[PDB]
């Protein structure tokens, strides 16, 4: 038993709700929350914006220091950072951008990071900006993950249309 609620049932071990993840992860206190991160975890916008404004930029800043000691990411790949106030670890994972022309086949090596953890708050990885199809990426994901992941999706509408079409 943990602690998630209000979740839908869509596998074994995929759980999925309506929900901000910023609210859901203050509430929750998650042992992991994902990010929707970038190779540079430069924060700006989606998910990594929202989850970084909520952290008051300490994610930024932590951030900052990975990158100037390691360099960017894969495509992909994904690093395990602080969760500041939101979580006790942040997983930086990196989907591909539709919108900067990357590989989407590399969407299945992102999920696979999720099965490093055994319990995961996360969003759909490559949906909102990085311009991936959600209802395909909640296919990799239920695919792909083994370990339990409670996806949160802001937008009611595209909830309800994932539900929906999900096989
Ligand atoms: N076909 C699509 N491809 C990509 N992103 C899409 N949506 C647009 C509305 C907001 C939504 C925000 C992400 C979320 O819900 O967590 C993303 C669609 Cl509809």
């Known amino acids: 038993v943990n602690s998630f609620s209000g979740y839908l049932k869509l596998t ?19 042992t992991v929350v994902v990010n929707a991160a970038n190779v540079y975890l ?3 916008g989606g998910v990594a914006g ?22 960017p990411l894969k495509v992909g790949g994904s690093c395990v950072l602080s969760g ?9 994972v990196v989907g591909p951008n539709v919108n900067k022309g990357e590989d989407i086949q590399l969407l299945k ?23 991936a199809d959600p209802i395909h990426s909640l296919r990799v994901c239920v695919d792909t993950v083994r370990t339990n992941v409670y996806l949160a999706v802001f937008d009611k509408n595209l909830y309800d249309k994932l539900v929906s079409s999900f096989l």
């Open 42 to 44: 430069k924060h700006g």
């Open 109 to 131: 090596s992102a999920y696979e990071n999720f099965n490093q953890h055994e319990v995961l708050l996360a969003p759909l990885l490559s949906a909102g900006i990085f311009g």
């Open 50 to 71: 929202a989850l970084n404004k909520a952290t008051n930029n300490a994610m930024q800043v932590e951030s900052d220091d990975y990158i100037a000691t390691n360099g």
């Open 12 to 30: 074994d071990n995929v759980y999925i709700k309506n929900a901000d993840i910023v609210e859901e992860a203050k509430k929750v206190k998650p």
């Open 84 to 92: 500041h106030n939101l979580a006790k670890h942040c997983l930086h």
